[PDB]
């Protein structure tokens, strides 16, 4: 939204925590076991 | 941005490897299985 975030040398830490929580959601999706064993 | 694309590729590969089991699980959940 702000033009300060449009530069690549400045980071938004809250966006980092949001996308890191997204990676943790992908991790919790990766925890499952889908082999049949039958 | 390519590392997140690799992550999405790994997720898509894991989901398309077991597409039949997830499909039959959703079919039992949605009551749509021809006996």
């Amino acid at each position: 939204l702000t033009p300060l975030e449009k530069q690549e040398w400045y980071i938004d830490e809250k966006l980092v925590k949001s996308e890191a929580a997204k990676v943790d959601l992908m991790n919790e999706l990766s925890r499952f076991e889908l082999k049949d064993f039958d | 941005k390519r590392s997140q694309a690799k992550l999405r590729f790994r997720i898509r590969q894991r989901l398309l490897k077991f597409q039949r089991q997830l499909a039959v699980a959703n079919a039992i959940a949605s009551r749509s299985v021809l006996y």
Binding site: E8, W9, Y10, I11, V16, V23, S30 | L7
Partner: peptide, 23 residues
């Protein structure tokens, strides 16, 4: 500081973390 970035590193098939890449 040239650039900040968020990279996704993979330690295992069950373990994906996020690090801060910096140039």
């Amino acid at each position: 500081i040239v650039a900040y970035d968020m990279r996704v590193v993979k330690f295992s098939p069950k373990d994906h973390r996020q690090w801060i890449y910096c140039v």
